[PDB]
């Protein structure tokens, strides 16, 4: 059985392994290029490239609107991600960000923004190799421009722009199956406000249960249990960096963060990123938990307009049991007004998902490397979370 809906006209031309090729080697698919195309790729007539300065508030709003109206939706068209402008700044301007890697497509005549793709730099540990790579995210084509082969042009153009800076590998996640996943993860969900989630058909009411009984089943403590939990502060930057660096060594695909990157990714910003640390009776920070804020717009519901979701980010345990840490994460999310807590089955997350009453969801998230041939891994060896 060859075809399963995709004969990969674009992807078969790219330096990636074929779907169903078993990989036993480790290394690049093609050599580092010593001459790179200087000219942007040709777009269809009436469209032009534009590098978006997200420090211009109006341009940031334009990107916000493109994504708010055209980024990831569920298959029944009830929910769409609603990344805030300030979130987008957090995700797209980490240390080493470049304006040319905020790659937009605009209509020539009206200047309307109809396409986007982004690269951010990251050091990536893949098995026994550490490479400088980029992370690709926020690939989006306006709904009215769909299936016109614009996505391959966006992909080739960010590839060129990244090659110009001397980087020849990338890491990316998507919901679609492409040549070739290095790992596959599943989304899991922990109800915090089950009433609302049942009302908007995110969850279903179980066979023999009432609304009041489902509320009781998912009821959480009013405050966390772990001794010495508190918000991350500036003084915790070094130890958070140390804890994460050491904790991530056990996995096979991880970021390798500088202290400035740890500051950027974890230092709390209201309604974007939350990090809590465990400072013990000695004064030592031994664990931390983190989650980011990503609501989804709710279409076609009479009462509820926004689904408030917290996403598990990086959780490091050395002295507090992981089960207790995540229990505290759920409590903190509840306290802050989240409707649901989402997590993937990567890292050690399978050790707590069922025990803490997460339900499995519909969506697979595929992890990919560009121009790096290595064996695939189980979800539990994946130690990388992209927003
Ligand atoms: C060294 C540096 C390298 C840097 C680059 C690294 C690689 C980066 C790779 C990008 C990582 C992105 C990370 C994220 O942001 S993942 C999030 C992606 N965004 C969305 O899902 C938002 C909603 N959907 C859309 O806006 C559009 O439908 C998109 C833009 C996704 C496709 O637009 P459209 O629906 O109008 O289609 P087309 O006619 O233009 O093109 C169809 C072709 O594109 C292939 N396709 C479809 N979806 C994806 C996808 N998510 N990754 C890679 N390829 C994808 C498809 O197999 C086909 O190719 P082939 O089957 O013929 O081969
Ligand atoms: C409440 C809700 N809102 N919405 C819009 C949805 C679909 C749900 N249901 S869901 O919670 O179970 C869920 C969730 Cl969050 C996300 C995805 C998904 C799918 C494909 N790509 C991505 N990304 C791509 C790139 N980024 C680095 C990572 C994101 C995410 C699928 C599901 Cl099915
Ligand atoms: Mg298109």
Swiss-Prot record:
Gene Ontology CC annotation, any one: plasma membrane
State the annotated membrane topology for this chain.
Answer: Peripheral membrane protein
What fragment of the full-length protein is this? 115 to 496 of 496
Indicate what this protein is called per its UniProt record: Glycylpeptide N-tetradecanoyltransferase 1
Impact of mutating residue 71 to P?
A: Abolished glycine- and lysine-myristoyltransferase activities
- Report residues binding tetradecanoyl-CoA: 9-11, 138-141, 147, 149-151
Phylogenetic lineage: Eukaryota, Metazoa, Chordata, Craniata, Vertebrata
Q: In which tissues is it expressed?
A: Heart, gut, kidney, liver and placenta.
The protein's annotated catalytic reaction(s) are: N-terminal glycyl-[protein] + tetradecanoyl-CoA = N-tetradecanoylglycyl-[protein] + CoA + H(+); N-terminal glycyl-L-lysyl-[protein] + tetradecanoyl-CoA = N-terminal glycyl-(N(6)-tetradecanoyl)-L-lysyl-[protein] + CoA + H(+)
Keywords for this entry? Answer: Acyltransferase, Cytoplasm, Membrane, Phosphoprotein, Transferase
By sequence similarity, the record places it as follows: Belongs to the NMT family.
């Amino acid at each position: 059985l060859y075809f399963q809906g995709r004969s990969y006209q674009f992807w078969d031309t790219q330096p990636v392994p074929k779907l169903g090729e078993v990989v036993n080697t480790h290394g690049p698919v093609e050599p580092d290029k010593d001459n790179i195309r200087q000219e942007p790729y040709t777009l269809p007539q009436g469209f032009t490239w534009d590098a978006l300065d997200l420090g211009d508030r109006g341009v940031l709003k334009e990107l916000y609107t493109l994504l708010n109206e055209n980024y990831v939706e569920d298959d029944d068209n009830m929910f769409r991600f609603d990344y805030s402008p300030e979130f987008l700044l957090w995700a797209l301007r980490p240390p080493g960000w470049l304006p040319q890697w905020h790659c937009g497509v605009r209509v020539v005549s009206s200047r309307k923004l109809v396409g986007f793709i982004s690269a951010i730099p990251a050091n990536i540990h893949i098995y026994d190799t550490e490479k400088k790579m980029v992370e690709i995210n926020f690939l989006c084509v306006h709904k009215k421009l769909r299936s016109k082969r614009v996505a391959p042009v966006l992909i080739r153009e960010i590839t060129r722009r990244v090659h110009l800076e001397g980087i020849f590998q990338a890491v990316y996640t998507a919901g679609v199956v492409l040549p070739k996943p290095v790992g596959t993860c599943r989304y899991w969900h922990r109800s915090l406000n089950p009433r609302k989630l049942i009302e908007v058909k995110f969850s279903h009411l179980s066979r023999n249960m009432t609304m009041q009984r489902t509320m009781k089943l998912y009821r959480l403590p009013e405050t966390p249990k772990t001794a010495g939990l508190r918000p991350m502060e500036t003084k915790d930057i070094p130890v958070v960096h140390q804890l994460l660096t050491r904790y991530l060594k056990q996995f096979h695909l991880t970021p390798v963060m500088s202290q400035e990157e740890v500051e950027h990714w974890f230092y709390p910003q209201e309604n974007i990123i939350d990090t809590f640390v465990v400072e013990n009776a000695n004064g030592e920070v031994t664990d931390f938990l983190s989650f980011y804020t990503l609501p989804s717009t709710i279409m076609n519901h009479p009462t509820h307009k926004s689904l408030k979701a917290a996403y598990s980010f990086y959780n490091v345990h050395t002295q507090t049991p992981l089960l207790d840490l995540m229990s505290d994460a759920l409590v903190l999310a509840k306290m802050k007004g989240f409707d649901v807590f989402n997590a993937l089955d990567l890292m050690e997350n399978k050790t707590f998902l069922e025990k803490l009453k997460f339900g499995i969801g519909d969506g697979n998230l595929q992890y990919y490397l560009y121009n790096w041939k290595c064996p695939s891994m189980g979800a539990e060896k994946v130690g990388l979370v992209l927003q």
